[PDB]
């Protein structure tokens, strides 16, 4: 027998590479190549591990880079680090009316201005100051850019393939009987949320529970719903915006008086739908534990204002809703209104050095969205208590990128055959 | 859940002899040594691996669910309490005698 050479063979290996984008905004879109064909590979089984997937870290650092790049050409609010004079506005005690001296377009003259500040944004030293005046430097977000998520497709370079798992009952790890090949993923809207996943993708078969190793209580548990749970969030206040000339060609946007009465912002969720989704979750979670065990629920134990409350962005404004009423039940074997708070000084991505100011939005803010998953923490130590937890944004992306994996294509092979070269 | 057992409660070993203590547990197992009045120190972190700076005489072997801690050339300062731990759960250790 004699060895031969084949240049086209279906062979793949595990490797990590740079994935590019295919599709103003904070995440730069229209800088992505405009965008299909999907091939089903038959009689192939491959192993997927979503807890060491590399496509999560790359997308995390890409989104961080996009945020930093988009905040660069905007106004710096360094002259706003000043001693304010705040007074009560007459949701009692939440708003403040603060007056202060500010610089003007002439270097040797000043002006006296005022603005409406939330209670969560000021601290005392009658004299108040911003929260970040001792830890961080604050920059204003440009009003042109929009915070609304837009789907982004991640595509592999030439010579590289993306394999996805089409198994409906697939958990976090293990072989996938039904495999397929694409070169660009589905639209993945970048949404930030700490306790409830919003605008996600549903499960076709049923609720699914995935953790790295469920015996370890230090690992979060990801729950994926099969039907959405509609939630309606609103800010009833009618806001008015102002402009202040703080330098040569530099404007700071302040809030004017609220037109009409002042009411609390909130969110509504349906009681029956949530009382059925909790039952399905309890059953699928009782699969792992003993049938005699009883499943409790409780609200978060403690932490930051970002992990104790469900935090999100509703049309350019930041909400921190209290979800103590959702997670209060015990299972053995009308609507729910969630009060929310609003903050303007936003420090995110778990950095302690770079703050950001969100300009006020005039009008009434309304959001209608789905709830497509939960992130929980089981307490350790015949009953189990599960409390919502979050704060790390890589779980949010693991929830979406569990199917896909990236493979090198190696097309050279030397097989035996019965022929010789003349 | 986690089922755990420590059979060699009290042991009487002489200097220079080799002894073993059996810990039965589910999951990753750690061997710790704690002198009386002092904070525990890590000896074996996975049940068969050794920690940096520990004497080479200490070693461990895992056979099925059973775990064994083996030492050779016992020293006068080598007599203390030794316990196995798994995640949050731990059982009181074994005290040897001179």
């Amino acid at each position: 027998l004699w060895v031969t050479v084949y240049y086209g063979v279906p062979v793949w290996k595990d490797a990590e590479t740079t994935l590019f984008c295919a599709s103003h905004n904070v995440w730069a879109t229209h800088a992505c190549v405009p965008t299909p064909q999907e091939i089903h590979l038959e009689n192939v089984t491959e192993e997927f591990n979503m807890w060491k997937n590399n496509m999560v870290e790359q997308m995390h650092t890409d989104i961080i880079s996009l945020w930093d790049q988009s905040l660069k050409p905007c106004v710096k609010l360094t002259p706003l680090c000043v001693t304010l004079q705040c007074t009560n506005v007459t949701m009692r005690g939440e708003l403040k009316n603060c007056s202060f001296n500010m610089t003007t377009e002439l270097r040797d003259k000043k002006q006296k201005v005022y603005s409406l500040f939330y209670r969560l944004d000021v601290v005392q030293i009658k004299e108040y100051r911003l929260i970040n005046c001792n830890t961080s430097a604050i920059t204003q977000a440009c009003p042109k850019v929009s915070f609304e998520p837009i789907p982004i497709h991640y595509c592999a370079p030439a010579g590289f393939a993306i394999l996805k798992c089409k198994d409906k009952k697939f958990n976090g790890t293990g072989p996938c009987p039904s495999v397929s090949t694409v070169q660009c993923t589905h639209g993945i809207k970048p949404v930030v949320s700490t306790q409830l996943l919003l605008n996600g993708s549903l499960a076709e078969e049923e609720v699914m529970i995935r953790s790295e190793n469920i015996t370890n209580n230090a690992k979060n548990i990801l729950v994926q719903f099969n039907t959405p749970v509609q939630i309606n969030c609103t800010r009833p206040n009618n806001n008015t915006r102002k402009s202040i000339r703080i330098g040569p060609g530099q404007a700071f946007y302040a809030t004017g008086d609220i037109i009409g009465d002042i009411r609390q912002a909130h969110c509504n969720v349906s009681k029956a739908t949530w009382n059925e989704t909790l039952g399905k979750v309890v059953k699928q979670l009782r699969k792992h534990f003993g049938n005699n065990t009883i499943i409790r629920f409780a609200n978060s134990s403690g932490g930051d204002l970002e992990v104790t409350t469900h935090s999100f962005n509703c049309g350019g404004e930041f909400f921190y809703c209290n979800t103590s009423g959702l997670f209060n039940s015990t299972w053995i074997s009308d609507s729910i209104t969630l009060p929310c708070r609003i903050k303007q000084i936003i420090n995110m991505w778990q950095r302690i050095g770079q703050a950001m100011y969100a300009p006020p939005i005039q009008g009434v803010i309304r959001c209608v969205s789905n709830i497509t998953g939960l992130i929980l923490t089981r307490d350790g130590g015949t009953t189990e208590t599960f409390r919502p937890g979050g704060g790390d944004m890589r779980d949010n992306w693991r929830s979406e990128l569990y199917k896909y994996k990236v493979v090198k294509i190696e097309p050279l092979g030397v097989a035996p055959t019965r022929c010789k070269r003349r | 859940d986690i089922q755990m057992t420590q059979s060699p409660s009290s042991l009487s070993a002489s200097v220079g002899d080799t002894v073993t203590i059996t810990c039965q547990a589910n999951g990753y197992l750690n061997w710790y040594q704690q002198r009386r009045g002092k904070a525990p120190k890590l000896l074996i972190y996975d049940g068969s691996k050794l920690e940096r700076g520990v004497p080479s005489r200490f070693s461990g072997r895992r056979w099925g669910q059973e775990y064994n801690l083996t030492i050779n050339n016992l020293q006068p300062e080598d007599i203390a309490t030794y316990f196995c731990q798994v995640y949050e759960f731990v059982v009181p250790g074994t005290r040897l005698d001179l």
């Epitope: 790295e212 370890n216 992990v307 923490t377 704060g391 790390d392 | 750690n30 890590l42 972190y45």
Partner: nanobody
Framework: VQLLQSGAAVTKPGASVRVSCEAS????????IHWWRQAPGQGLQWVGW????????????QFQGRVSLTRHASWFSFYMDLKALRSDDTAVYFC????????????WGSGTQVTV
Amino acid sequence: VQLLQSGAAVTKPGASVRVSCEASGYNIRDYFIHWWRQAPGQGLQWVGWINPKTGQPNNPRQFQGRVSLTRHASWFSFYMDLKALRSDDTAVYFCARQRSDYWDFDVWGSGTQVTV
């Protein structure tokens, strides 16, 4: 990578106590910190962990409602609280530094011996 612990304290039942615990040695945000308490002549008992990045605590059913854990970053000191004490809460408390998925602790504090 060394953990400094505060001194001992004696208090009456139905009081509050604080046991500061500070880490100065390493990159602190990347590792959890656990608390253990032991009674005289008995094995260790788990009390719970705290996440340095977000401050999320975790406690067993017996201790929940009585103990709260808090951290205070500086431009890292970990605390512990006990709202309601009792005769049997006299123990010794240790800080531990988890560093892997095996829950192996390689650094411990000197310990605080609290009597009631």
